[PDB]
Amino acid sequence: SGKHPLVQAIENSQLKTDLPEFAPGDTVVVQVKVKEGDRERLQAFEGVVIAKKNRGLNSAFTVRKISSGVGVERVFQTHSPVVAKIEVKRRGDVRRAKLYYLRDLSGKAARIREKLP
RNA sequence: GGCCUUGUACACACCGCCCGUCACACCAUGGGAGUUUGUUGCACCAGAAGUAGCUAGCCUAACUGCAAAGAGGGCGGUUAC
């Protein structure tokens, strides 16, 4: 809430209200709307959350995965309608907010320990 | 020119035979800056399915228990090859 109240009201008018709770280090699945022609479908994007930005309607989060041997990252915008659904598969236990050190690790070295209840 | 003996790689029989360099043509081959294929010895990295061990996170028909539960099992995690 570092913006003017009018901007805050205009932004708050468009907030999603069913977002789950997740943190860096968690592995998540994102259902992404894909529209070609008149054809609509949901594509799954599963991976580790390596960064989270809490900025109200300007919130974002970065998901990293290994796809066919090639690392790929996507920075989703949390309140965008293209993000249909987010599910948390497993909760991770980490020591810092940003996990960029994972980019230089491969295989067993990049494993994230599960957070035990 | 004629007889005996002797040496000979000559027998078209010394107007014999025959060797090497240089020139011409053809063939196979050695060396050679490098270019390239296969295979292999060490050292390290990564590492599937599978097998062996550990683990106590989650889920659970046959057995025990009136029931909470227990035993057993499965999924997962983890190490070695």
Nucleotide nearest to A114 (CA to C1'): B57
A57-63: long-range contacts (C-beta < 8 A, 24 or more apart)?
A57/A11, A57/A12, A57/A14, A57/A15, A58/A11, A61/A22, A63/A28, A63/A30
Looking at the DSSP bridge assignments, the partners of residue A29 are: A46, A87
Looking at the DSSP bridge assignments, the partners of residue A74 are: A63
Do residues A98 and A24 touch, judged by C-beta distance below 8 A?
A: yes
Domain that holds residue A117: 1-117
Domain count for chain A, please give it: 1
Length A75 CA → B29 C1' (Å): 70
Do residues A50 and A102 touch, judged by C-beta distance below 8 A?
A: yes
Method for this entry: cryo-EM
